[PDB]
């Protein structure tokens, strides 16, 4: 009875909509809560195994389901779930429903609107990492499907980052947004729009100055390197901003910045590198003489990289005078055996590259 | 003179670190003091012995609130002051300031963490570089750690050390013959003393800690009877109760860092020996 | 030398790698402009700073302060217009603190501007900032609007209000947030007719914003808007928006409403508070979110106080009371703590009889609350119940609760109750302490935790102060002297600490007659610690002591202490002798 | 330089390959194990997902410089070149009975001295089989970056890092070039000997308007990731044999493992330099640590 099956689909949608969720008392309506869980599982297996089970009437009820069971104001961040299984079932149900080939984005474009996207985005600040992962996947699918909403999504994410970097400096979902944005970047057109350049300069670069760079550092580095791959021209400003945003007090942040500049130099172009050696190597000479052994080890691993050697040997005359004083002073004073060996190896390479 | 030391102690009491010149002056005076006493620094009853503060400065403040403040309370410390660098510099400075200010009232032993390599590994050197930039503070405190006494003899009847018994040594005269002014290796009687642990299995056993030698109950018993030791006290091993008894109640382990790493939630304990050398234990939770 | 030599060294410092050198130069710009000619600073120095100065965040912050201070150096209000462009770029800088302090300095220098100068230069600056492409300039202009408005012509006032309307409709939520923040001030500057014409639709639109932050900021602006409006039109204009915000889905909006509840009640008037604010407050107390419930709790006492005298009792009993009872048994600890902190002040408001009938059982239930800080809070403000009702009715129930709170396993609870105890002594009376609480004090003194002991000593000072010296003389002195005989040295020196504390308040004769003999007796203690603390005690109590007794007994004992093997006792004895001038 | 991407032979690191095949009741199973050395305690090895036993190969080389002892590198079922009767089955108990049958097949009659080293899920397998105690002769267990709570917390980070490279690689030299470029494998020869078994031969860019593929599918692993790490820390501490753990960061340890370590139950060493490929980022350092552990515990004798 396929028509009856779809009507029972709608009825179970209504049942899962009403207050039979795990949020309510598990003991009260316990059979109801359990049959709600089993109903979500049955819905998922039904829409997986069966085909052509998505009709125009279906979309509003599932959208209302997602809004009711998910679109709520985030709980207070008392930190300086019992209902989680049902919520996770809702997440995976919605995810597969989007993944359904029978899904038609044009049909759902009325049901999924800018308000829906905005409430989904504000959900991203949830403390649960699993919640953030599911939301990340959901937003990625939505952005992939809906072409029209993409500009609004980008603008709303830009607003979220502006509030984060300038007003609140407290957002748990930064990493997920960053990786989604990187996925978007990979598909950017070769001539970058002025909106994209403004996004890079005014948003991502200020992310570095944010105190909690550690939690979202790899994703930010990936986005930056993706832009640098997209356009070589944008490399020159960004690195100086990197120098401008360089921290003078936190050694671990210095290690993180090293990492980023290492990837940048891995993807750098010689024409930009000849422009940007002097401040970069000034900061690097400060770092090699920095008392912290980890930053020193990272800056010495810089010499281990082949591409960095090649680029430095390309223009020895400018780099060498900056490196010589810090290298000589570090030659005079050294404590750790590993750092001593690394600095001496760097001295040997510097003697080889020029005398 | 002593006025500067008192002002420095008050500064540290306000959770404010001292300057490089003050640090080096304190290290020099502390070295002068430490050169005087023997490896087995005898201590007279009464005294309060604590476990491993492990750099939680505010936990040390709670400890002083619970047991009194120097010089009102004679304090004996097992060691391991340098640890995860939350506020390890502050507590190390405070202890050395107390020691220089009150040579008799405060006695501090050398924990196995008190080595240059261990300080660098556990971030204490990183904490020094974060706080001061210059590595000179770390060098001065490492040099001071070289002078720290290895063991303590409370009233001649109780033996105290950060680790445990060493197979190479059966008499206190052996430790007295040892030289403490050197970097502690991963071997030798000094490292065995610093890293040993009490174990139920009889006899000397290879330590799973990576250094020292685990010893049986009969090992501790025969050591005590040979050296006339009423009791053996130690640290470096956690107790959820804060204080543990083992080896026929001849070995007692004391830990003084409550909720070590702020995640374990273990209670901390301190052992006070009164005038009549009667031990008692007092337990406390981490400060808010 | 060079005429532009200060400018030359400024250029060098900008070129100089040392940012600290630039910071020092920026700080010393005051002296530089003092030495430099005023017209020289206006001609080049200000354009130089506007054009080529791109410094670090704190350096630009100091620069903003220095430009704010250049009101006099520029030549007074005559040339402050030339100061505007230097501050303009400083408003646009991406950092937030720099633009905040820049707009603060702009507001400060606005007053110096004459109305003709204000219209000529400052209003075009505000227009440029509001029309600036980046949202940060609009954020800065939001603050400027209020100080700009009052002194300018009516037509330019209409232009300014139109620009504010445009900003409040901006797409970027940050600009809307800033506009909502400055809306109350701008309404204050505006006249009443234009306020009704413009702010109320503007305020309603901001309250209906999708973003919760904009809505909660509109909630804050609602207080100022209600203050400006006449009470009669509050029902028609601002009240429905207040009700809509009170029932917002977001818990943050309801949190903001609860936080500003008392101010809203005061501004709106008593009648509208009775007719509309009471049901909203009842909903807030029964709100699903615990944080909103706690916030509403924190404002309970003030809200009850601001209620009209005639109906306050009936309103609280009929409507507020049941919600109070419900929240008494609330699951959340923070909510119960806040309620216990605030619930009591309702007792004078309702009267003794009403407190006894309903409030008193609530107090009894709150006393038996498992969580400690709740009992601490109810103990805290006990003066209100003390005055409103008899002390015996409260005391008979408190005494067991005080007993278990004092004997708590956690030492911090004991420390808190000891800290709180002297107020309880003053309220309950001397006999009430003597019959029971003296044993509690003795247990605290003999407690193993030192912090408990020192808190007990301070409490003892407060007790002898409140209850007179003779009461402690009859009771406290014998027990503190007897407690010195403890075998453990720590409890023994606790007596010395008690003597040090009590000597100041007790008096000279009582000092000489009783505890001086005990201190001299313990001066011969075997432990070095007790001995040097005896020396410290003699040092502290010497000024109170008579010179004849000091020479007769204190001096030989101090001399003997000086001649000792222990270095610390020697030092302390010598220091005490020097301080007392005996030696 | 370092432009040579020819895969190094297994012969240098492991003297012999034996593809041990045993026919269980379910069917024949081939194990593709590597044996090196003449005499000495067996160094049983276990690699994590997306890796091979040959990834340990350079590590193996390091340790033959340190301590003379028989070395056995085992390839996991459905991983590497191992031929499996039931590729779909990946149960933890199945893995334990698998490695027990491997030990029985290799010698069975006389069990030589055998100590276990595991990386990523390989460490979890080593812990599980130590709890099973199927091996009659046990000396010591070592895991590298194997913590239950942290693994459950950081599954997605490892999945993303492994998925960073493209799924289809035209040549093995292309994969080796990717490894040397990305820095995941510090040693070029380690990469050469690793990818050869890591891959097999047959999240998405949002556009705006046969090559070597992954031998291991991340989907099935993530499906079964939760099962392997269940109760890992408690079973690890339940092990009676001595243990040694190496981790990049001391803070990365879980509360239970931190309490057990500081209590003195097992030794730890911190090597911040190692990142994603902890065992192969600094193979010499971890090899020296293992040699020191063996000589201290007298399980194996030095050269």
Residue numbers in the entry:
A (entry chain B): 34 to 113, 128 to 402
B (entry chain C): 6 to 293
C (entry chain A): 7 to 589
D (entry chain P): 37 to 238, 251 to 257, 283 to 376
Q: What do the authors say?
A:
The cellular functions of PP2A rely on the formation of structurally distinct diverse heterotrimeric holoenzymes; each consists of a dimeric core enzyme formed by the scaffolding A and catalytic C (C or PP2Ac) subunits and a diverse set of regulatory B subunits. PP2A holoenzymes are highly regulated by carboxymethylation of the PP2Ac tail, which is reversibly controlled by PP2A-specific leucine carboxyl methyltransferase (LCMT-1) and methylesterase (PME-1). PP2A methylesterase 1 (PME-1) is a cancer-promoting enzyme and undergoes methylesterase activation upon binding to the PP2A core enzyme. The high-resolution cryoelectron microscopy structure of a PP2A-B56 holoenzyme–PME-1 complex reveals that PME-1 disordered regions, including a substrate-mimicking motif, tether to the B56 regulatory subunit at remote sites.
To define the structural and molecular basis of PME-1 interaction with PP2A holoenzymes and dissect its multifaceted activities, we determined a three-dimensional structure of the PP2A-B56γ1–PME-1 heterotetrameric complex using single-particle cryo-EM. To trap the enzymatic intermediate, we assembled the complex using the fully methylated PP2A-B56γ1 holoenzyme and an inactive PME-1 mutant, S156A, followed by covalent crosslinking using glutaraldehyde. After extensive 2D and 3D classifications and careful separation of the tetrameric complex particles from the unbound holoenzyme, the structure was finally determined at an overall resolution of 3.4 Å. The PP2A-B56γ1–PME-1 complex adopts a pentagram architecture with a size of 100 × 100 × 90 Å. The PME-1-bound holoenzyme has a similar overall architecture to the holoenzyme alone and maintains the majority of intersubunit interfaces, but exhibits three major structural changes. The N-terminal 10 HEAT repeats shift significantly by increasing distances of 4–12 Å from HEAT repeat 10 to 1, resulting in a 12 Å shift in B56 that alleviates the steric hindrance for PME-1 binding. Most prominently, the interactions of the B56γ1 internal loop (IL, 110–130) to PP2Ac near the phosphatase active site in the holoenzyme (right) were abolished in the holoenzyme–PME-1 complex (left). Finally, the methylated PP2Ac tail no longer occupies the A–B56 interface compared to the holoenzyme. The PME-1-PP2A active site interface remains essentially the same compared to the core enzyme–PME-1 complex. B56γ1 interacts with PME-1 at three separate interfaces involving both PME-1 structured core and disordered regions.
